Amino acid sequence: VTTFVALYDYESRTETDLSFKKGERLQIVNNTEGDWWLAHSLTTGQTGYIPSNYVAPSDSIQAEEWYFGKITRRESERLLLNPENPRGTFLVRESETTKGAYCLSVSDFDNAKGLNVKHYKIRKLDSGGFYITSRTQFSSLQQLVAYYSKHADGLCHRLTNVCPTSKPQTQGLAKDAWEIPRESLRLEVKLGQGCFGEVWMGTWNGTTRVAIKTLKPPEAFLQEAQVMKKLRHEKLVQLYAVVSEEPIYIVTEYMSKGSLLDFLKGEMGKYLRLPQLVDMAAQIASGMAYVERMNYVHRDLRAANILVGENLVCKVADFGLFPIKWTAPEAALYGRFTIKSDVWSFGILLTELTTKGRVPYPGMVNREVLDQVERGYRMPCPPECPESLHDLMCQCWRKDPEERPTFEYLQAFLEDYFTSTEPQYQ
Numbered sequence: 001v002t003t004f005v006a007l008y009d010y011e012s013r014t015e016t017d018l019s020f021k022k023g024e025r026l027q028i029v030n031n032t033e034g035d036w037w038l039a040h041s042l043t044t045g046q047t048g049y050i051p052s053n054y055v056a057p058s059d060s061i062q063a064e065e066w067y068f069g070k071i072t073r074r075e076s077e078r079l080l081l082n083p084e085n086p087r088g089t090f091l092v093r094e095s096e097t098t099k100g101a102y103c104l105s106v107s108d109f110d111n112a113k114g115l116n117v118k119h120y121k122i123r124k125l126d127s128g129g130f131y132i133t134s135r136t137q138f139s140s141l142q143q144l145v146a147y148y149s150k151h152a153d154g155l156c157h158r159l160t161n162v163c164p165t166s167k168p169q170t171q172g173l174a175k176d177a178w179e180i181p182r183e184s185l186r187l188e189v190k191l192g193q194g195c196f197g198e199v200w201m202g203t204w205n206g207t208t209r210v211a212i213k214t215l216k217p218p219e220a221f222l223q224e225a226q227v228m229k230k231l232r233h234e235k236l237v238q239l240y241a242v243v244s245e246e247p248i249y250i251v252t253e254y255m256s257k258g259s260l261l262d263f264l265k266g267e268m269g270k271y272l273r274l275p276q277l278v279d280m281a282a283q284i285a286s287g288m289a290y291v292e293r294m295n296y297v298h299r300d301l302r303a304a305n306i307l308v309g310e311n312l313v314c315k316v317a318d319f320g321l322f323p324i325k326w327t328a329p330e331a332a333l334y335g336r337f338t339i340k341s342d343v344w345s346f347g348i349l350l351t352e353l354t355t356k357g358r359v360p361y362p363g364m365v366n367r368e369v370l371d372q373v374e375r376g377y378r379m380p381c382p383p384e385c386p387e388s389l390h391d392l393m394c395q396c397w398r399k400d401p402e403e404r405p406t407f408e409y410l411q412a413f414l415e416d417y418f419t420s421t422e423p424q425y426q
Contacts (some may be wrong), residue, residue, distance in 0.1 A: 003042070004028050004055040005063050008167035014174050014207045018048025026055060036175040066145060066162040068093045073105070074282060074415055075234070077117045078311050079163050080107040088160035092141055095121055097424065104132060104148075105163075108156045118156045121425040144195060156426075166310070169253060171232065173204055173240045178229070180204065180241040185212055185249060191258065195322075197247075204251060210240055213250035221248070221321070228320045230355035231294055235287030237307055239316040255307035255315065263308045264357030274386070277353045278417050280314045285411035287316040288346065292339050292407045299337050301345040302326045303352040325360045325369050330401060332370055340401030346410065347396025354385035389417075 004026045012019040013138060018041065026039040028050075056062035062069055067074060068091045076091055082377040087109045094101040109115055120132045122144065130144050133139040136153065138144045149159040153237050172178070185202045192199035204210045225242045228236040232238070243249040257263050260280070264272075284306060284359040292300055298305075298319045305318045328344030330336045348360045361369050361379060381390035392413065398404045405413075 001059075002027055002029055003058045004031070004039070005058045006055055008054055008165075010051065010054055011207065012048070013205050014049075016049055017174060018044075018046045020044070020046075020050065020054075025058060026050065028055075035171040045123070049175045052292075053168060053171065061141065064092070064142065066090065066092055067141070068163070068165070070094050070096065072096060072281070073103070073119060074286075076105045076163075078279070079165055080105055080117045081115055082164070082311060083115070085163070086161055088157035089163050090145075090159050090161070091163035092122070092145060095271070095425075097258045100124060102130070103425070104105050104145075104155075104159075106156055107163075119425045120155060122282075142170075143200070162179075169238060170223040171238075173208060173210070178241050179244060180251065182243050182245060182249060184249065185210070185243075187212055187214075198239070201254065202251070204240070209254050210251040211254045213252065213375060214247055215250070218248075224320060225250075227296075231291070231296065231319070233287055235283050235315050236290060237315045238321065252317070253315070255309050255313075257308035257310070259304055260306035260308050260314055261303040261352065261357055264303060264352065269356050275418060276312060278389075278414060280308075280312060280412040281350060281353055282411060282417075283314040284316060284349070285346065285407050285414050287314075288409035289411045291316065291319055291342075294337075296320070297337055297339055298342050298345070300326070301342055301349060303349055303357065306349075310419060324366050328401065329370070329373055330397070333374075336401075338401060339407070340404050343404040343407065343410070344401075346407070347393040348379075350389065350393050350396070351379055351382055351385075354382045354389060355393070358382075 005026045006022050006026065007018045009022040010020050025042045027042055028037045028039045031037055035052055037052050039050045061067050071098065072095045076093060079210060080089055083169065087107060089107040091105050093103050093105065095101040096387045098121065102124055104120040104122055106118050106120065108118055122130055122132050122141065124130055128139060129137045130139065130141055138147065139242055145159055148155055168410065173205065184204050187200035187202045189201040190198055191201060197213060200212045202210050202212045205343055220240065222244060225239065228239055238253040240251040263269060285362045288298065288301065296319065298316065299321065300323060301384065302323060307315050307317050324332060325350045327346045328341035331341040351359060351360050364372060378394060381387050396404055
């Protein structure tokens with residue numbers, strides 16, 4: 001009754017932690033809130049720390065290969081939207097809206113709609129009962145799923161394939177790692193170079209694929225990397241460790257696809273449809289909606305400071321610590337850098353997003369822009385970019401910061417852009 005189960009396959013990166021394959025039964029006595037727990041594999045007889053978020057009690061709903069827990073409706077769609085997923089690919093999660101309730105997200109396919117995802121809410125009747133419909137109830141989510149894996153009963157499709165999912169991100173590199181030794185990082189590929197440093201694709205402890213931001217020739221930054229250490233969100237690139245000795249290094253989560261900009265201009269940004277870029281914009285607003293309620297400020301939001309992953313996952317990087325074209329007037333003429341100037345910047349990012357990577361104000365020069373904008377100038381609606389998306393941009397470009405939307409609004413607006421006149425759940 002202390003047995004946990006591995007949700008995904010994990011590989012060691014230290015002498016103190018331990019590798020384990022998805023499914024293995026681990027033994028953990030003190031499962032107090034924490035990121036790393038000392039566990040014992042009943043399978044291997046091995047002992048070592050493990051990322052807490054990679055296991056779930058064996059006799060639990062979370063141990064269900066099809067229960068994604070508190071996965072957001074959008075990330076569930078992202079996952080469920082994988083082309084290599086037959087109709088009926090599903091997952092079960094907690095409905096983040098009508099709290100207490102549960103949700104069954106199922107993938108479909110119809111030419112007049114293409115790949116889509118139907119969200120059937122399951123009402124966990126207080127009295128225990130469970131149902132997607134009243135005329136049909138069960139005692140466990142495991143049974144409902146069982147039943148619908150053999151019966152459509154109205155559902156768009158019969159529950160078939162359990163929605164896949166790659167391994168998540170451990171929180172941190174190791175149990176206590178943070179200000180690691182420069183001797184552990186093995187830079188092996190350069191993918192950047194700015195006026196503040198470069199960004200390599202290194203390796204930590206030989207096995208770990210990280211990302212090192214070398215800021216070749218301060219110390220008063222460390223005190224800030226601490227607050228940047230706490231900010232934990234899915235749409236925010238994770239900062240693993242930082243080095244004191246100069247030059248100062250910054251190890252961070254590695255994004256296979258690279259920056260959103262390049263990704264846009266490359267040989268992929270073309271086949272990128274509108275619901276794609278809007279999704280990509282929704283992720284970014286989510287991350288910034290977090291940076292927002294955390295009372296923080298990015299100070300330099302743009303498609304260059306955004307990294308992309310596998311299934312069009314986009315994450316905000318560099319948050320915290322020139323780019324006039326992205327800077328809100330007040331920030332450039334008063335140094336007033338707030339979450340509102342950040343919103344301004346976000347509207348500019350919407351133009352790169354909707355213009356395959358095109359530069360904001362294609363025709364003006366740095367100095368020009370600041371002045372054009374002061375007189376009230378604003379970019380026009382890009383080619384084939386909905387006029388409704390431009391209206392959203394214009395709201396971000398309002399003169400008065402207190403007249404620009406919250407990222408919470410931007411996210412909400414962006415997540416429901418296409419399904420505005422449809423019901424949340426079937």
